[PDB]
Amino acid sequence: SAIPVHPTPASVRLFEILQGKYAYVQGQTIYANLRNPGVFSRQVFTHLFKRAISHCTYDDVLHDWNKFEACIQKRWASRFRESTFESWSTTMKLTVRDLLTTNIYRVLHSRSVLSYERYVDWICATGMVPAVKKPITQELHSKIKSLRDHERTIRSIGTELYEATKEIIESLNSTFIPQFTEVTIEYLPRSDEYVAYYCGRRIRLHVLFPPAIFAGTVTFDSPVQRLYQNIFMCYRTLEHAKICQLLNTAPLKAIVGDILTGSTASAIEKLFNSPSASLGARVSGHNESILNSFVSQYIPPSREMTKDLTELWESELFNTFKLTPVVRLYVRYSSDTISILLGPFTYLVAELSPVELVTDVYATLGIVEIIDELYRSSRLAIYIEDLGRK
Amino acid sequence: SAIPVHPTPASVRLFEILQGKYAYVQGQTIYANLRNPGVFSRQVFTHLFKRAISHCTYDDVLHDWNKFEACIQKRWASRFRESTFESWSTTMKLTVRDLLTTNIYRVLHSRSVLSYERYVDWICATGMVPAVKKPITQELHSKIKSLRDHERTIRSIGTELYEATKEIIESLNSTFIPQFTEVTIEYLPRSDEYVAYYCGRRIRLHVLFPPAIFAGTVTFDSPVQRLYQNIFMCYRTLEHAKICQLLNTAPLKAIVGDILTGSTASAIEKLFNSPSASLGARVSGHNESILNSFVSQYIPPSREMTKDLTELWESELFNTFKLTPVVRLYVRYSSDTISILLGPFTYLVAELSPVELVTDVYATLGIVEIIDELYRSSRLAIYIEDLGRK
Amino acid sequence: DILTGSTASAIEKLFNSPSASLGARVSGHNESILNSFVSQYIPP
């Protein structure tokens, strides 16, 4: 009256292939390229930054420029203004850049419970994602006070940033994805749905590509499910090649009825006497007689299979996710893989309603130009140019 | 008096070939490139956006520019206007861009019942499409209220967007395409038509390429139906190659009448004694005698077949759908595949009467320039230029 | 069970099947063979 899905041997083997146990080949090492936390943290960095600079207005900047110019002029005529302005501008830019990033980094690289890497291992090789709601403890609640630790245009930004970082913490520390064991998924024929059990308790479960069930089996809609059949035809011949090599090693055959770095004169006297120096085969049912016999060596070709799997992996992962190589030197996210892999994670699993998705160009640049670009098209930037041209 | 079509073994095998069970080759991994949801969601994004900006008029923009310029001038002579205008313009552009996309994305990436991917699996390998009408529940009806949660030119856009997103939701959540099982298709000779049964009930069924029936069989008009004959001639020789390799493995033959990572000195002593070290063949009807005998090894060529299927797949899918590669690096939709695969889905299956089809250029660009282009040729854009040149 | 198998039972199964030899008989119950040959030809 209920058929099991996840704790099945086929599924666990499908999971172990991802760790690398059966036939690891030079093509599979692209999987660890869309698995880095990476891009995710490049998205958060953009929401906190933006928000902050969105607070300044046309009043405080005007008043502060008034005060600063007044002070410098009080210190000690068509060139004076143009000479003093280009210092104030750069000073403001660098003070903002020094204020924000050192606080953002601590929030990024600290400990968290929600792990992006345990999300991809569920999409590939299964198709569906379990989740668990967790209560926010006070041991992280006390960290908010530690997080709490003349120009007004800086005085506001601090508070808005303090408030923006408030919600993201309580959101990042409230969902837990049990990695591989102790989670059970099951199918119910009557009123057909899918259920999930975590240490004897019903929890959430999101389905993205329903596995077809033809009353005998289960088959997922997963990039690994398709390659499951070639990988084993390769791993079962790597194991036969070796059986063929360990039999064509005796120097002479018949039909009957301390070494790597050694002394090279004792090694030989040792090997010439071992029982690994001949081979004796007997074929007789105690009454039969042999009528002919032959000999030859055959060694299956095991070095071309592993040259095919490389292209197979590279193509099956370049198509299904739309990764674009640059020239091969560097492989990176493209505006399509962003959507497919971060839609159902930002808006569906995590309750990160205000966060957008990251632009395709902000996903492969360095930070030095990301800071510049974000500072360029922000409301603070366009007021200073208005101030410059009187 | 009625001949069955779908639950037939031939058909189910034709369906399983698409999942990858018989001979998966490097060419087949183009099929998963026209199967992504992808382009479909790039179409919706264009109808909601456009509609919204279509609402503004020549009145509100004029009055709001009046108010804004009045305020800024009240703050504190041929350069003043030209200096203040280029700030208002960009401010309006970015506020619109920040308003619309964050609401569109939530509607796009949320849950829905109508699945584009279960449409292609019906076109290819069968030719016809079943469908089921579903009632719109109230659990999504309550989500419309959650969806409900100074310049007038923003105040209108919000309402028109709220109304545009209204109909698309109730349209997207009202059609269900049963994937593979529990749907039965049948042919009636008298008054010849095609009928569909879903858990004991007649439903819709759309035919796009009628299968020819020559009174013995059924044959669909499907790209997989043609390749059905080569795929099996290949998969039935991959299985014979292996039978030939597992017989040419004994080191010596006659005619009668813990290993991969081991100790390399115990492995040998184990293998030299196993019954896998010889081969004994007997050919005698208890009274016959052998008159001659020979020996040789033949291993069928199984590495060139799978080099032919690759080109066969690539061509059979490049021609039948008109996909254009860019240089191979990237494969993408072309103005012809758009028509052939999204006509009968937007206007025939789904009742999406107002939606157009997507332009061939808006289907391979990123979002950063799509937003720009859509904002360029819209009625709002052409009023601001009119305002600029007095 | 052959393509993805145990490679130690597959062999013990194949070595005993009747697909391991070939026996040809050419005699009209009274004829005798005078010579014989062997070769493989695979059409292009």
Chain B hits for A376, CB-CB cut-off 8 Å, are none
Chain B hits for A282, CB-CB cut-off 8 Å, are 278
Determine which of B82, B111, B253, B293 to mutate to test the interface with A (most A C-beta atoms within 10 Å).
B253
Residue in A231, A227, A223, A225 with CA at minimum distance from that of residue A306:
A231
Angle between helices A79-109 and A152-172 (to 10 degrees): 20
Residue in A356, A388, A360, A368 with CA at minimum distance from that of residue A50:
A356
List, in sequence order, the alpha helices (H) in chain B: 9-19, 39-53, 58-75, 79-109, 117-126, 138-141, 143-148, 152-172, 223-245, 266-271, 305-321, 335-343, 367-376, 379-388
Structural resolution in Å: 3.5
The amino acid sitting at A335 is S
CB B33 within 8 A of CB A323: no
CB A344 within 8 A of CB A206: yes
The residue written with tokens 């695969």 in the block is B341
Cβ pair B249:C12 closer than 8 A: no
The total of other beta-carbon atoms located within 10 Å of residue A330's CB is 10
Chain C hits for B292, CB-CB cut-off 8 Å, are 36
First to last CA, chain B: 79
SS3 B322: coil
Determine which of A230, A232, A236 to mutate to test the interface with C (most C C-beta atoms within 10 Å).
A236
Chain C hits for A239, CB-CB cut-off 8 Å, are 7
- Helix, strand, coil percentages (3-state) for chain C, rounded to 5, are 15, 0, 85
Q: Report the residue of chain A nearest B266, measured CA to CA.
A: A276
Q: Report the residue of chain A nearest B295, measured CA to CA.
A: A294
Identify the bridge partners of residue A254 per DSSP, sorted by sequence position.
Answer: A280
Angle between helices A223-245 and A305-321 (to 10 degrees): 170
Cβ pair A240:C7 closer than 8 A: yes
Determine which of C21, C32, C35, C40 to mutate to test the interface with B (most B C-beta atoms within 10 Å).
C21
- Tokens linked to B79: 């350069």
Q: How many pairs of residues across A and B have Cβ atoms under 8 Å apart? A: 177
C-alpha torsion B358→B363→B367→B373, nearest 10:
-60
Chain B hits for A275, CB-CB cut-off 8 Å, are 269
Cβ pair A229:C4 closer than 8 A: yes
A235: region left, alpha or beta (phi > 0 left; psi from -120 to 50 alpha): alpha
Sequential DSSP letters for B244-295: HHTTTTSSS-EEE---TTS-SSHHHHHHTTSTTS--EEE---SS--------
Q: What is the Rg, in whole angstroms, of the alpha carbon atoms belonging to chain B?
A: 33
Residue in A349, A324, A295, A316 with CA at minimum distance from that of residue A131:
A349
Segment holding B128, helix H or strand E: strand B128-133
Q: DSSP secondary-structure letter at B344?
A: I
The total of other beta-carbon atoms located within 10 Å of residue C24's CB is 8
The amino acid sitting at B30 is I
**Residue of B33, B257, B329 with shortest CB distance to A289:** B257
Identify the bridge partners of residue B4 per DSSP, sorted by sequence position.
Answer: B186
Chain A hits for B277, CB-CB cut-off 8 Å, are 247, 279, 281
A186: region left, alpha or beta (phi > 0 left; psi from -120 to 50 alpha): beta
Q: Report the residue of chain C nearest B239, measured CA to CA.
A: C3
Q: Report the residue of chain B nearest C34, measured CA to CA.
A: B291
Residue in A194, A192, A229, A228 with CA at minimum distance from that of residue A208:
A194
Q: Report the residue of chain A nearest C11, measured CA to CA.
A: A240
CB A135 within 8 A of CB A207: no
**Residue of A233, A239, A240 with shortest CB distance to C3:** A233
Give the C-alpha separation, B304 to B241, whole Å. Answer: 12
Residue A225 CB partners (closer than 8 Å, separation 6+)? A14, A125, A219, B19, B20
Give the C-alpha separation, A187 to B182, whole Å. Answer: 16
Cβ pair A233:C7 closer than 8 A: no
Give the C-alpha separation, A384 to A65, whole Å. Answer: 10
First to last CA, chain C: 32
Q: DSSP secondary-structure letter at B9?
A: H
B326: region left, alpha or beta (phi > 0 left; psi from -120 to 50 alpha): beta
**Residue of C11, C19, C21 with shortest CB distance to B283:** C21
Cβ pair B277:A276 closer than 8 A: no
C-alpha distances (whole Å) from A329 to each of A126, A325, A332, B119 are: 31, 7, 10, 37
Query: Nearest CA to CA, how far is B186 from chain A (Å)?
Result: 20
Q: Would you list which residues of chain C are within 8 Å, Cβ to Cβ, of chain A?
A: 3-5, 7
Q: DSSP secondary-structure letter at B32?
A: G
Give the C-alpha separation, B341 to B223, whole Å. Answer: 14
- Tokens linked to C20: 């391991």
> 3-state secondary structure string, A68-125?
HHHHHHHHCCCHHHHHHHHHHHHHHHHHHHHHHHHHHHHHHHCCCCCCCHHHHHHHHH
> How was this one solved?
cryo-EM
Q: Would you list which residues of chain B are within 8 Å, Cβ to Cβ, of chain C?
A: 238-239, 242-243, 246-247, 249-250, 275-276, 279, 281-283, 288, 291-292, 294, 296, 298
Chain A hits for B295, CB-CB cut-off 8 Å, are 294, 296
Determine which of C2, C3, C6, C15 to mutate to test the interface with B (most B C-beta atoms within 10 Å).
C15
Q: Report the residue of chain C nearest B246, measured CA to CA.
A: C11
- Tokens linked to C23: 């026996």
Chain B hits for A328, CB-CB cut-off 8 Å, are none
A191: region left, alpha or beta (phi > 0 left; psi from -120 to 50 alpha): left
Residue A327 CB partners (closer than 8 Å, separation 6+)? none
First to last CA, chain A: 79
Query: Nearest CA to CA, how far is A55 from chain B (Å)?
Result: 14
> 3-state secondary structure string, chain A?
CCEECCCCHHHHHHHHHHHCCCCCCCCHHHHHHCCCCCHHHHHHHHHHHHHHHCCCCHHHHHHHHHHHHHHHHHHCCCHHHHHHHHHHHHHHHHHHHHHHHHHHHHHHHCCCCCCCHHHHHHHHHHCEEEEEECCCCHHHHCHHHHHHCCCHHHHHHHHHHHHHHHHHHHHHCCEECCCCCCEEEEEECCCCEEEEEECCCECEEEECCCCECCCCCCECCCHHHHHHHHHHHHHHHHHHHHHHHCCCCCCCCEEECCCCCCCCCHHHHHHCCCCCCCCEEECCCCCCCEEEECCCCCCCCCCCHHHHHHHHHHHHHHHHHCCEEECCCEEECCHHHHHHHHHHHHHHHCCCCCCCCCCCHHHCCCHHHHHHHHHHCCHHHHHHHHHHCC
The total of other beta-carbon atoms located within 10 Å of residue B300's CB is 14
